[PDB]
Ligand binder design. Structure first.
Ligand SMILES: *[C@@H]1O[C@H](CO)[C@@H](O[C@@H]2O[C@H](CO)[C@@H](O)[C@H](O)[C@H]2NC(C)=O)[C@H](O)[C@H]1NC(C)=O
Lengths: 49, 18, 49
């Protein structure tokens, strides 16, 4: 979540969602473990690698 | 793509292109 | 010597102008390709500027 920001480098920040260097706007983040996670593991989410 | 600064006043130059 | 100084001063100003391309001006390199082939784009602009 720290890596969704302008000028960041890495796996997801460059292969999934790259923000512009002069990006204007806001980044929203909040905890979702108690709703997005289920017993046995949740496999409904995919990311490019 | 990268758009010219003339067409965008406040926003970022880069626009959705996927 | 009156005519020689004009030739000397004019050529000395061009030699100084070209020799200014081998300076860093507070950056990390003078060759521009080195900056663009060693650093990521977000921090390459500040070195180029
Ligand atoms: C809009 O539709 C066209 C037509 O399908 C797409 O053009 C194809 O793009 C793919 C990959 O970019 C190429 O492999 C094809 O050769 C292109 N032509 C055709 C006839 O398929 C275009 O990519 C689509 N654009 C968007 C934004 O969806």
């Amino acid at each position: 979540v720290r890596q969704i920001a302008p000028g960041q480098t890495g796996k997801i920040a460059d292969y999934n969602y790259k923000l512009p260097d002069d990006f204007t706007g806001c980044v929203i983040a909040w905890n979702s473990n108690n709703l997005d996670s289920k017993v046995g593991g949740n496999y409904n989410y995919l990311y490019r690698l | 793509y990268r758009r010219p600064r003339e067409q965008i006043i406040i926003g970022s130059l880069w626009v959705f292109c996927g | 010597g009156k005519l020689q100084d004009v030739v000397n001063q004019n050529a000395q100003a061009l030699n100084t102008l070209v020799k200014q391309l081998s300076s860093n001006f507070g950056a990390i390199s003078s060759v521009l390709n080195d900056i663009l082939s060693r650093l990521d784009p977000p921090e390459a602009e500040v070195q180029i500027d």
